């Protein structure tokens, strides 16, 4: 009986996004949602859900649906997705082998690009080990790669865990940036609020 | 749907200063680039400046480095650009352009425009 | 420095007619340009920001193409409310933003 739509648009439009080590979540809830305006959309370079054909999202009802968005490199985009090891994948964002969605990903080189070097998007390198899936990573301790100890001492032993792109335009196809939505969706035994454009 | 109106436009002997502003109402001035062009009266258009989306990252044209100082008042969606030490070229008409993305030297484009101010720089 | 070179200088067309105009670049630009619509009486506007992509809010009728150091802009029917000059930018090297000349276009 819920009639609205829900904001797609500030999570797709958006001006500017997170980091890869900071990706933004968003509750999505009470909504009439169309998919196909999405689908249809021929702005996104990969559309990959796994375990649902993406068609069908129409008359799929869930209970809520989470928004994930961060700006990952070009031959990066691979690391995102089930079963996967990377540089991101343990260290930066991890999926179940589970997981239940779709991923959008579309080229990013006319916002992300300054011919200076944009330097707003940060990654990490190095951690004690590797993280469990859908948590996150803020904290900024200098790393322990050695004997010698750090006292809030950047050196030799301590490294920063955290690295920045050196996005450019004139960067290779590779190497630019691009701006990943995820979307997972979860359903048990509650009552679903996320349902899509059927006449009762 | 965007409205960019100027001020500023008038008689200035060469050497003096003039103060621009621009208002902003038809949309979000918080997060987005703003530029300054300029048109000869017999030329074709050409870029003076820009800002970022915050007061951060400021770029200058080559002909107008060390003269020209643009502002940014996010708080009234407002931004203002400081010309001083005036020549007689500078009689061009200059319009307050709108940047797609939030920084200054990006590939993206001037989407919105507006009616420039026209100046003049003679005795 | 790079020099942006506008091949036209003056067309002529009729209410049923069909032109195009193009822009060459000295440098390799990879599909980074713009047209802009100079009405000579009020503020111009955008048309095509990228090399094929057309902004919301103006007729599709317009189409452009090219890529490299080629670039061309073609008008299908050249209605009555056309008459204007373009100007074909290029935002890809050092010298930000760097406008070609003016094309103009009277139709009779």
Known sequence: NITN???????????????????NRKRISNC????????????????????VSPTKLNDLCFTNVYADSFVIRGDEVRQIAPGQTGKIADYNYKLPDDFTGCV????????????????????????????????RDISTEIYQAGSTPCNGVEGFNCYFPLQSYGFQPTNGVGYQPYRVVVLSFELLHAPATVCGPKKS | EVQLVESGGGLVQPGRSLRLSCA????????????????????????????????????????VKGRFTISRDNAKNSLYLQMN???????????CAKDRGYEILTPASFDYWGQGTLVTVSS | DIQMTQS???LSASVGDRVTITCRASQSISSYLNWFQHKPGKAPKLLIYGASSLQSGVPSRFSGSGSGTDFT????????????????????????????????????
């Open chain 2, 85 to 95: 030490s005036l020549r007689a070229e500078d009689t061009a008409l200059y319009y």
């Open chain 3, 73 to 108: 802009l073609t008008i299908s029917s050249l209605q009555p409310e056309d008459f204007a000059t373009y100007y074909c930018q290029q935002s890809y090297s050092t010298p930000p933003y760097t406008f070609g000349q003016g094309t103009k276009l009277e139709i009779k």
């Open chain 1, 104 to 135: 959008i990903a579309w080229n990013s080189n006319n916002l992300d690009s300054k011919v200076g070097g944009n330097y707003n998007y940060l990654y990490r390198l190095f951690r004690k080990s590797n993280l469990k899936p859908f948590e």
């Open chain 2, 24 to 63: 902003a109402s038809g949309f979000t001035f918080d997060d987005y680039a703003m530029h300054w062009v300029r048109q000869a009266p017999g030329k074709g258009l050409e870029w003076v400046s820009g800002i970022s989306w915050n007061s951060d990252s400021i770029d200058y044209a080559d002909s």
């Open chain 1, 32 to 51: 009439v949602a169309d998919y196909s305006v999405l689908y249809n959309s021929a702005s996104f370079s990969t559309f990959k859900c796994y375990g």
């Open chain 3, 8 to 10: 036209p200088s003056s």
């Open chain 1, 5 to 23: 739509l829900c904001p797609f648009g500030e999570v797709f439009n958006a001006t500017r996004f997170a980091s890869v080590y900071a990706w």
